[PDB]
Write a protein that binds this DNA or RNA. Structure first.
Lengths: 199, 199
DNA sequence: GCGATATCGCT
DNA sequence: GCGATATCGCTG
DNA sequence: GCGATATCGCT
DNA sequence: GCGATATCGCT
DNA sequence: GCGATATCGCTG
DNA sequence: GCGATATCGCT
């Protein structure tokens, strides 16, 4: 539809094919409100793991746990792969397949300590699974609090009301949330691509 | 709506107010088919006369024979004033009014000889009043021929079917037509802003 | 077999 | 085909 | 856009 | 008297 | 506010 | 866009 369409500001295009194994992917959902579906994915190589944002819905079938794929003309914004109709995505050839270390996989399912998160620069993109607290409904928002035990952080959802909690004691899983500090006590804020659900 | 909106490629913006008397103006009509009304006007100063294209319909009332106006932030493309919502157009102050020579006025109602027209570079914009010949209807066009007596030139209308002829022996008046030469015998071709009517 | 249209190139 | 003009997307 | 040449199409 | 929203600046 | 990306408008 | 501060508004 357009070369950089749906791509983040300043993302760098990556030329050469890279082959990865899919760990994880979410349902497509909706943003830029009402237009623009996308979905979230985690993939790995032998060396490292990447978080992915997928703007071309045709790719949804290629993204399934443990499936190997080859990507080219994708975009990297600050370490997060972004992918749209401009990229080519193939089912990988066996010769291109490889082993993926337990470490890497452990490492890519792993969630930071709220303590450690708070030492991070403003605007940092946060992902993780968290225990939850009392929510709220506000004319135009929703409010959480989540526990690492050793915190303690508030979470602000600015988007819209659909999803599933989940009868509270269900835990809470976060994609692409924005760290905000300022003068106040810091919080995690919803963003373009933000996604929450029960784990 | 947009600074250069409806303005011709490479038109230069004119900063300082200029004061002119309206000789002539046409009804608004329609182009870029179905969108984009505009209208044609002839105006003069003491020194010279200009052909004008007016894309802001609010200006229609300001343009009436013999009325003096002040224009600023208008555009000149190859000697043809172009005017849109970006320009300012005021009813002129009497101190700004002036005399307009018979010569200039004669000169701006005046039509070239088809002979002399044909020595002109391709793509030149032609205006004039002309005697007419047998027409045609073609699936997607209309064809004329017009006489200066000493020519002899064909005319091609690519636009659409509304206007008034006029029971042939009515004469024919042309705004902003394109001279086309090439290998063939030359012709006058309809364009974006082209307009024909009976005089 | 001519004129009316469609394609090219870049304007 | 390609530069000019308008809209999009939010550092270091 | 638009002008020029290349092709279409009635007959 | 706090949190939820609206505005600013430029990102 | 402003540079980057996409669409607009057709020399010399 | 988005983060930060400035203002709104229930009570």
């Amino acid at each position: 539809s357009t070369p950089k369409k749906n791509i983040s500001k300043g993302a760098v295009l990556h030329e050469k094919p890279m082959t990865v194994m899919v760990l994880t992917a979410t349902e497509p959902f909706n943003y830029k409100e009402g237009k623009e579906n996308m979905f979230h994915a985690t993939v790995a190589t032998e060396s490292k793991y990447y978080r992915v944002k997928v703007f071309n819905m045709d790719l949804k079938e290629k993204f399934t746990e443990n499936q190997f794929i080859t990507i080219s003309k994708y975009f990297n914004s600050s370490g997060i792969l972004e992918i749209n109709e401009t990229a080519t995505v193939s089912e990988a050839a066996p010769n291109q397949m490889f082993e993926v270390p337990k470490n890497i996989i452990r490492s890519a399912k792993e969630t930071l300590k709220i303590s450690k998160i708070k030492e991070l620069d403003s605007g940092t993109l946060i992902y993780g699974v968290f225990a939850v607290e009392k929510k709220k409904v506000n004319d135009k928002s929703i409010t959480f609090k989540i526990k690492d035990n050793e915190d303690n952080i508030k979470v602000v959802w600015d988007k819209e009301q659909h999803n599933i909690n989940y009868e509270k004691g269900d835990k809470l899983q976060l994609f692409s949330f924005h760290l905000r500090k300022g003068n106040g006590k810091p919080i995690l804020h919803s963003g373009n691509h933000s996604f929450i659900k029960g784990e």
